[PDB]
Structure formats: structure tokens, C-alpha cells
Symmetry: D2
Subunit: 254 residues, 4 copies
């Protein structure tokens, strides 16, 4: 079938890539337009690029991650096992939908790890609105809405909770909240189920640094930033049994 | 067919009498379909553990005589569909003993250090050393779980959350630090290392267990049913409690 | 004696400034922004920080005074309505001086020369884009290899600021120390960090040494500039201290209570 | 000079203890367990804490030494394989002395005072609710499991597990950390750990219940009808015997980070 392979850039990834492509020279044809199997070689950062490269056809693509360096949560296959990889089950992980409104039109984005909103320099002040209901007035560095699979990324470093990627939900964590009598925040991470909409509304400044995984751009004149669990899912190709918690253990505990 | 529990104070007992007077409703504490709690969340917990054997045929209603609770959302000046929340199944192994929790289930030592092996799905995850561990229900996240640094999750999510209690987290006993949220059919097994005497607590019930071989945690198939008359959002209840 | 007054910029602060200057004009007070002995900041903590760095070359000859036109600050503890009593007490010289410790930041390059900075609140170091990875060396001894957003070294008085939002502890400004806090540490198998904030005494040096990237985004009291080809970043408690003019007694813990709990 | 040795209890501690006593049998060392000048602890930090309270009324005439039979401790810095060197070094009388600050715990109901090397915690006997007073000034009303006041050297103990900051023992201060605070509309607490210098008094005053489970280090007691719990940096200090540079941060490193040569 149709497939394609992306590379990190280093010699180890490109050499391993060419080594695998020649292996398919079976009934496998290389195609980067309409692939059925996308293979990422490098790390989680490399895998994220492959996700956004083919986010228009997530329903017809199974992803496979290979790490040339340290173990990743997406790139979970060693280069020494590249021979065996060249008949599988499909595992689906939830994604995050980020919608931005302006003063025009609106923009939507898909996240595999998380989406963060920070200030354009000074203090980040927004009103956190949960399901058309005011919850808190936040003041700090920013806010982080994480995917289940993305909880082991930025979310964890921010003191968030680790969620199993079988749970369809999203998690909101604080970034250096001042948390005083004027700007009282919840402090605890908040996990939202499906059909729940978290709305971030400006108070004074209208310019925000919205980031989606590995892409941070400046959005001017922002009226609203809404978060909710996307209906679209990312599909993986399961060959062996590598449990999520086991993958967490090998990463942080060892 | 229904029944009514009371906290113990005069305000709760007298209000209870008024509700009986209001009720083709036959008062039956044997096989009730409607259980009404009067007092607070603590009183509500007592009503839950009173009928664990018939949680599938009972809809609960909470009335707070004191401050607002997460389970008692009805003011006493209002005595005049079903919503299901997940539960936590706690199994202690020696003949095994099982317990159901509405808020959470914590395991501490019987005096000295608390040292166990955290096993996730028959696979060792970490060796814990500290005060103890806390496995919380979705609805119980706004309780002890929050104080321990745990995350707040909406009760519509069927899962369980494990949080640390003063982990030493060093070379020998490296822990994850972050709270862990486990879905359905996931089993967290806590296995002793040396001392096998632990102070296992289920919600408001803290009992001492001797000769413990294994403590297993998993989301129970049984769910607690509430009676929804109005619409009080979970996040609004969190807002009114911690954000004033 | 010689004095000067800085203003936030709004009408209220500027108005208060002119009236105080006229107030001092009734006594033996000379206005001088070049070599003053008393620097009065009118506005907020941010305004106070600007006045600090404006005269960081003569901190030994200056007693600072903060006046908050808005909400109460940790550096600006005087209300505008007390400006009249402030002038009269300043003119007589009826006040004692209280000293707060400062943080010394030293940046080394691939010999550029060598840059030094003084911080009243804190000094932070982050990357210039990607992952921030450095080796934390405490007193010429390797302590940890850090990977994350960055690191924040705070002064005692600066603990109630960015430090607190990062989970740092609150120290009384009488304690001569500095506090290092983590900024979103990945803290895994490869990059194991302490997690806990670290309080260092005087004469202790925390050296941050690069692993791959030499470019770092260093900020001193929100003066964030890009430093290229960085060889070393050293942290130590400065021998220089900031001097305040004390007329009454506003306890640090009360200022903490009035700011984060209730007022 | 006069010395004594405490033991954990196991075979390793008792055997190593006998070897040292016999080791001092070639030098001018008098063994005395009632009025010693050098107290040696064999076992762990728990053993050291026991040796501290055993001779806490003569802290001015005693320099302590710790030997860890198991993992590295913050008070037991010496290895069992270095016991041979310790005897000769102690006999030669060649060592500088290092002093660590202590925590003074006062319980009023007559007045009871306690000295802590690590920390002093106060819990309930149900909900623990007290009013935290800092220098005769109300700061917050706490509600949770309890409160922990830690010594500088004690910051690496329970204080670290509670999320407190690590302080160098050269700093004469004390640190207050929360224990499972509820922090809501009614009971708003600071959250952050608080570090107090000398001459600063932290007063814990009851709200409803007067009974509290007050613990000082290993000693966990129960005080009834408590009116006030006072915390302040004690004037008394514990003295150590230094032979070689073993930095505090190294002990922190070798305990929480990694120990590659072990
Ligand atoms: N604005 N201003 N003045 C700079 C002061 O801001 C304090 N400081 C900072 S400065 C670092 C920064 O760029 N943060 C992005 C958001 C932000 C900038 N300035 C803030 C001031 C208050 C609150 C948020 C910000 N962040 C924080 C922080 N999250 N919570 C508390 N306090 C901070 C820090 O003490 C610094 O000295
Ligand atoms: N009782 N007692 N033990 C004395 C030392 O134990 C230290 N201490 C304590 S005492 C409070 C307590 O009952 N903890 C329950 C579990 C436990 C007891 N002792 C431990 C020692 C190490 C680890 C866990 C325990 N907890 C802790 C704590 N989580 N992490 C570190 N160290 C602690 C505390 O500093 C005290 O100095
Ligand atoms: N036992 N009991 N009561 C039942 C509920 O009390 C809730 N729960 C507890 S019970 C554990 C305990 O023994 N804590 C000592 C102090 C305490 C006891 N009950 C409390 C209730 C509120 C606040 C403090 C206590 N602690 C906590 C906690 N620190 N912050 C929040 N909520 C808690 C917990 O959810 C439990 O299910
Ligand atoms: N790897 N990679 N690509 C970007 C991903 O990196 C993850 N991500 C980030 S991105 C936010 C950021 O700019 N942080 C500054 C330093 C940094 C950039 N990328 C990093 C990757 C690992 C560690 C630090 C950085 N920070 C973090 C974080 N502290 N700990 C864990 N993971 C993070 C985040 O999930 C993002 O999706």
C-alpha cells in the first residue's frame, strides 16, 4: 500500500530512513500525497510535524513513530527493530480543538499534545469561562490545555496530572498564576470531558501568543479562545503490546 | 417507597419529620427507591454506605443544613431524571474483602514508614515511600484529592485518580510525582515490601488492616444515581467553593 | 539633603509628585536626580524597580521610599494621603535605614568580556527558542542537569513575586540568601532535577553551564535581553544592599497577608 | 576525651560499635555514656535523632558524629568502611566544629518546651483547624491535615516530601509548610512555604478543638487543652565534628538525584 517516511534531519534519521524504504522494495509504494501509513523517524517533535503535515487525512492514515535518540511517547520503536516493522491493529487517541475568534472570521486548530496561550510580553490576564459560565479571572504567564496523550509532555512539567490516552478528555493547567485576592484562581488542574467548552476571554490586552504543539504564533485583536475535545482522532498502528503506563515508567521513573 | 437519614442535630431531625408529613409515598428503610440525606456531605456519605447492596435501585438527594456541599446541593428552605457518578472499588487481600468508595480510598502505614510497590496492570510502576497513597473518585476529586495536589475532573468521566501523600521521592524510591488518572478495567495493585499492617481508609471510614498481601484499585461497575430536579453545574459548584 | 522623585506617568502620580516637591521646598531639601540621597518612587512595584536600576551605581548613598497610587505593593507601602507627613519626617531626617539583600548575576562569554547585573526581585534564564538545557553547578560541583523552560533565582524580597507563582517559598527580607526555583522541569530519567526550590546562603555560587545551545534569554527584573555565545551564568548574593527609609513599621508578613489573603 | 556510641539495634550496628570501642583502646579515649564530649551515632538519621534527644541537655559540650549502616543520611555522613579512619582522626583531636540551628517548640495549656533537629508538626486528634499568628498578628486560618515547622537541616526530611524548599543549614531560620490544606472561600491560606528568621514567633492558636497531636521529630505526643503553640529559632545549636569537606548540597545530590560511584 501507499506510505511515506519523514526524517528529523540528522544523519542517523536519514540513513535509517533510506534503510527502511529499500526494505519495502513488497507491494509498498512511496507516496507523500495520499499515504496510508506515515512513519516518523527521530523523536516526538518529529512525530508532531508528521501529524500536522497530514492532519487533513487523519481518518485514512496510521502513524508509526521511531526514535533515533531517547524513548518518546509517540516514537516508541527502536532503530534496531526497524527490520521487523517492515497485519496490524489500530489504536485511536483523542485530540484537542482550538478555536480563535477576532473582532474577521475565526480560526480552528488541532493539537496532539497541547495548546497554550500566553501574553505578548507583559502580564497574561483573561477570564476563564466554562460552558458560558464565568469560573475565574486568571493572571500569570499563561494557560495550558492538554490532550490525554499530551499530559506526559508540557502538562507534566507544569505540574499537571497524567491521563491515560483512552480517556476522551482535556486538561487545563496554570502557568505561574499570581493567585491573589484580586486574581483568585483554582490552582488545581482541571479535567474537562467531551462537549465541554472552555472559553478564554480577554480583559485588557487583546494580543496573545497562541501555541499549538510546536507552533507558536502571535494573534492580534483576539475576542475569544475556546477549547473543547475534538471529534477527530489520531490513529496508530499497533504491532506489539506497549502499555502507556509502562511507557511512562521507562521515561520518568527509570 | 423512600427513606430519610439525619445528621443528628435538632435542625436536621425536625426538618426530617416535616418531609415525612409531606409524603402515595410509603416510608421504607428496608427497600427504598429514594434516599434523602439531611446535614452535609459527611452525612451523605453515611447514607451511601448504608445501601451499597442496592445502589442500582436507589436515587439519592442531598440537603445541606449547614454550608453548601458537593453532594448536598439543596437548601433546607426547599423541603417543599437520574444522574450517575462513578465509584471506586477497593479490594484487600489476605478470602478477600471489598469496599466501595464515593469520595476516595487512602492507604497509610500503621505507625512507621509506608513502603509499598505500585503495580499497574500486573506490571511494577514504582516503589513508594511516604505517608501514603490516595485513590479518588471523579466526584471525590474536589475533596481530599484536591488538598493533596490532585486534579479536579468532571463526574461524567468514568475514571479514578491516584495522588501521592508526602513522597520522599529519592534514588531508592523514585515516584512519578504527578497524579495518575486510570480509566475503566485498569487495576492499581499496592503490594507491601516489609511491614504488612496498613491503615486503609474508605471515605469517612478508617480501619486498621493486619496481614495485608495486596490492595487493588479499579473503577467499580456500580454507579451512584442522583435525582436531578434543577441544573447545578459541577464547575459552578467548584467556583462557589474555592473561588468564592 | 538632596532628593528626587520618579513618577508612574499617569495624572495622579505626576500631580502628587509636583505637590511633594513644593512641600520639600518649605524645608532644607534640594531636588537633584544626579546625586540624590533620597529617591521617592510614586506608582507601583514596577515603578520602584525602574527607580532602583536608575541608581544602582549609588545604592550605598540612597534611601528609597515607595508610594503606591494604586493597590498596595511590597516596595511601595506608602499611600498618597500620607505624602504630607512623609515630607515633614523626611526634612527633619527622622528615620532609620533598613537593608534588603540583592542578587548578583554574572554572564561569561567565549573570550566578549564579562557582564554583571544586580536584581531586586529575581533573575531568570530561558532559551532563545527551543529546549533550555544547562548543567547546574553548585560551588564547582555538579548538582543536576536541567531541561525545561528555565530557572529563576530570586532575592528574599523578590520571593513574593515571580518566585511565589513558580511555587517558591516566601522568605523574610532580613535573611541574606537567594532562592532557585524550577520553571517547568521535565524531570525525567535523562534530566533528573531536585524539583524542590533551593535556598542558598551568602558566598555560595550557582553556576549554570550550557550543554549544547549557547544562546539564552536572560532577564533581570523583567529586563529580558538575548545573550549569545554564553559560556557561564553565575549566581551569588551580592555584597551590595538596597536601603529603605523606615518611618513607621509595615511588617513583611502583614504585607504578604494583605496581598494574598485578605485586606 | 570522653565519648560514647549509640547503636541502631541490628547486628551490623552492634558489631561495628564494638569494633570502634576496641579501636579507641590504643588511644587516650575514655568511654562514658553519661557525660561524653563526642557522641557517635551508628545506623541512620532516625538513630541520630535518638542520640540528639538523649543528650539534648548538654548540646554545648557535645560534638556529634553520624555513621550510616544503610543508605546515606543527612546526619550520618560516614561509611562503615571508613570507621578505621574515624577512630584515629578522633583520637588525634584534629577537627573543626560545625553548628546547625534548632527549632524551639513551646506548648502552653506548666509550659512545655521541646527542641527539634528536623521538624515539629501539629495535627488533630478529625479536621485540624487553627489560627496562624505571626508576631502577635493574625496571618491566616488553616484547615487541613496539619502544619509543619522545619529546621534548616530538617528541610531535607519531611519538609521536602511536603513540597517545602531545601535550605542550607548555615542559614539560621525556620520553615513552615502546609499539610493537605483545603484552601477555599472560608479557609484561605498562603499555600507557599514560609521561611522565618530568628526572633520571629509563629503562634498556632486553636479555633474549636483544643486537642492536638503534636510531634517533635520522632517523638509523636498528644497534648490536651492546648491554648497556644509557639515556634521560634532556638538559641541552642547542635555541634558536629568535621574532618573532611562533605558539602550539604552533595548530600542532597547523593540522596535525591543520583549516586554514580555507589
Ligand atoms: N510587569 N512587571 N514587572 C516584572 C515582574 O513581574 C514579576 N512576574 C513575572 S515577570 C516574568 C514574565 O514575563 N511573566 C509573564 C507574565 C507576567 C509578566 N509580568 C507579570 C507581572 C505579574 C504577573 C504576571 C506577569 N511573571 C510573574 C508571574 N507569572 N507571576 C507573578 N509575578 C510575575 C516578576 O517578579 C518581575 O520582576
Ligand atoms: N515518626 N518518625 N520519623 C522521624 C522522621 O521521619 C521523617 N518523616 C516523616 S515523620 C511523619 C510520618 O508519620 N510519616 C509517615 C511515613 C514515614 C514515617 N517516617 C518516614 C520516614 C521516611 C519516609 C516516610 C516516613 N514523614 C516523612 C516523609 N513523608 N518523608 C520523609 N521523612 C518523613 C520526619 O522528618 C521525622 O523526622
Ligand atoms: N475521615 N473523614 N471524612 C471524609 C472526607 O474528608 C475529606 N478530607 C479529609 S479526610 C482525611 C483526614 O483524616 N484528614 C485530617 C484532617 C481532616 C479530616 N477530615 C477533614 C475534612 C476536611 C478537611 C480536613 C480534614 N482530609 C481532607 C483534607 N485535608 N482536605 C480536604 N478534604 C479532606 C476526605 O475527602 C474524606 O473523604
Ligand atoms: N519536543 N518538542 N516539541 C514541542 C513540545 O515540547 C513540549 N514542551 C514544551 S514546549 C513550550 C516551550 O517553549 N518550552 C520552553 C523549553 C522547551 C521547548 N520545548 C521543549 C521540550 C522539552 C523540554 C523543554 C522544552 N515545553 C516543555 C517542557 N517544559 N517540558 C516538557 N515538554 C515541553 C510541548 O508539549 C510541545 O508540544
Amino acid at each position: 500500500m501507499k506510505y511515506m517516511i519523514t526524517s528529523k534531519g540528522d544523519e542517523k534519521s536519514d540513513l535509517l530512513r533510506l534503510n527502511m524504504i529499500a526494505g519495502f522494495g513488497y507491494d509498498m509504494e512511496y507516496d507523500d500525497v495520499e499515504p496510508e501509513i506515515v512513519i516518523s523517524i527521530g523523536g516526538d517533535g518529529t512525530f508532531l510535524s508528521a501529524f500536522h503535515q497530514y492532519e487533513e487525512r487523519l481518518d485514512e492514515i496510521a502513524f508509526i513513530g521511531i526514535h533515533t535518540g531517547h524513548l518518546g511517547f509517540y516514537a516508541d520503536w527502536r532503530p534496531a527493530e526497524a527490520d521487523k516493522l517492515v497485519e496490524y491493529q489500530k489504536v485511536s487517541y483523542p485530540l484537542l480543538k482550538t478555536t480563535v475568534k477576532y473582532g474577521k472570521k475565526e480560526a480552528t486548530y488541532l493539537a496532539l499534545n497541547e495548546s497554550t496561550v500566553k501574553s505578548s510580553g507583559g502580564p497574561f490576564v483573561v477570564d476563564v469561562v466554562i460552558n458560558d459560565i464565568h469560573f475565574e479571572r486568571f493572571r500569570g504567564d499563561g494557560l495550558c490545555m492538554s490532550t490525554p496523550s499530551g499530559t506526559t509532555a508540557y502538562n507534566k512539567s507544569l505540574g499537571g496530572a497524567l491521563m491515560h490516552p483512552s480517556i476522551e478528555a482535556m486538561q487545563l493547567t496554570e502557568m505561574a498564576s499570581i493567585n491573589n485576592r484580586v486574581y483568585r484562581t483554582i490552582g488545581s488542574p482541571l479535567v474537562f470531558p467531551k462537549h465541554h467548552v472552555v472559553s478564554l476571554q480577554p480583559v485588557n490586552d487583546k494580543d496573545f501568543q497562541i501555541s499549538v504543539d510546536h507552533l507558536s504564533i502571535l494573534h492580534r485583536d483576539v475576542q475569544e479562545i475556546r477549547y473543547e475535545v475534538s471529534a477527530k482522532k489520531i490513529h496508530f498502528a499497533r504491532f506489539r503490546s506497549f502499555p502507556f503506563w509502562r511507557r511512562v515508567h521507562d521515561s520518568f521513573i527509570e
